[PDB]
């Protein structure tokens, strides 16, 4: 039987549920909390001892980082590249104009000037690499914000502390209603997984999973209203707004960082082309469903699979 330890972490709730023979479930979820902490500070955005927060703040500078920091910063930009920007790490600049990055006083809409001139300091292809000396450079005045990714690398270093400790722990851990499986349930059996509604307190659907992991991106994570319209946090690198068309996206994936990362990338590109999404997005290895604004919900064939025990 399985412990529980909830907390906040990673700029949202997370849960931590875990079963161990070998070692006090207590001990392994104590473990992956004190790393989901260590994470959120360490990429943080605002954070005096983030990494993320000095290259941000060392411009046109070959600045000297850690193998951690380099891996997920290349896999940031790998998933921007696989998703021709979709996905984007440098929306820095663009959170820091909307006010996403600082104080609820600083949540504004700015004008369509202001966004056209983020947008030259937006673009992966900003962050430059030497892999000889493990250093990053950001050019253009870009500035890198992982809040896309991090929930996702997060989970995935929890389940690998847990199995570090016992092998055969089961469990899973959840962040924000991204969820990555430890163990199946009770050694045998898969979690059942509910898809929130993105505009009412129900269900819409219920997943099974034995492993792997599931992500949802949402127009409800995190907004602020201005005559009477929502700004959410989910923008379109290519037009510095919010992207708009669609209510929530989740993807079941192999890894939480796969599903978080591609989760933000199909919320973004499903607006413009839903059924090529669904289509194509499964060949990525990201099985969806999509919930358009209005309501309607449309789900790859792949997805449907998990729909039962």
């Known amino acids: 039987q399985y412990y529980e330890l909830r907390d906040f972490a990673l700029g949202t709730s997370v849960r931590i549920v875990v079963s161990s023979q070998k070692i006090n479930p207590r001990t392994i979820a104590e473990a992956i909390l004190e790393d989901m902490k260590?994470?959120?500070?360490?990429?943080s955005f605002t954070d005096e001892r983030s990494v993320v927060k000095k290259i941000n703040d060392h411009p046109n500078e070959w600045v000297e980082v850690d193998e951690e920091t380099y891996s997920l910063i290349k896999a940031a930009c790998a998933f921007a590249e696989l998703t021709d920007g979709a996905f984007d790490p440098t929306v820095g600049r663009l959170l820091e104009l909307w006010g996403f990055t600082g104080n609820y006083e600083n949540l504004r809409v700015p004008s369509r000037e202001e966004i056209e001139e983020a947008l030259k300091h937006t673009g992966y292809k900003n962050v430059l690499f030497d892999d000889k000396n493990m250093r990053v450079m950001v050019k253009n005045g870009v500035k890198i914000?992982?809040?896309?990714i991090a929930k996702g690398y997060a989970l995935d270093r929890a389940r690998q502390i847990a199995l570090s400790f016992d092998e055969n722990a089961t469990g899973f851990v959840e962040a924000g209603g991204d969820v990555r499986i430890i163990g199946p349930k009770f050694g045998k059996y898969p979690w059942v997984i509910g898809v929130k509604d993105?505009?009412?307190?129900?269900?819409?659907?219920?997943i099974y999973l034995k492993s792997g992991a599931v992500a949802t991106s949402g127009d409800?994570?995190?907004?602020?209203?201005?005559?009477?319209?929502?700004?959410?946090?989910?923008?379109?690198?290519?037009?510095?707004?919010?992207?708009?068309?669609?209510?929530?996206?989740?993807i079941i994936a192999e890894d939480?960082?796969?599903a978080d990362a591609l989760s933000t990338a199909g919320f973004v590109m499903a607006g413009k082309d839903w059924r090529k999404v669904v289509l194509d997005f499964p060949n990525m290895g990201a099985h969806l469903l999509i919930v358009l604004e209005g309501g309607a919900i449309?789900?790859?064939?792949?997805?449907?699979?998990?729909?039962r025990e």
Do not use: C, M, N, Q
Not at 38 to 43: N, Q
Not at 298 to 307: A, D, I, M, P, Y
């Open 298 to 307: 449309e789900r790859s064939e792949t997805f449907k699979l998990f729909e």
């Open 145 to 148: 914000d992982l809040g896309g």
């Open 38 to 43: 260590r994470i959120t500070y360490k990429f």
């Open 198 to 206: 993105p505009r009412g307190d129900d269900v819409i659907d219920y």
């Open 220 to 250: 409800y994570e995190r907004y602020f209203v201005v005559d009477g319209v929502r700004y959410h946090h989910i923008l379109d690198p290519s037009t510095g707004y919010p992207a708009r068309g669609v209510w929530s996206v989740t």
């Open 256 to 258: 939480a960082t796969t």
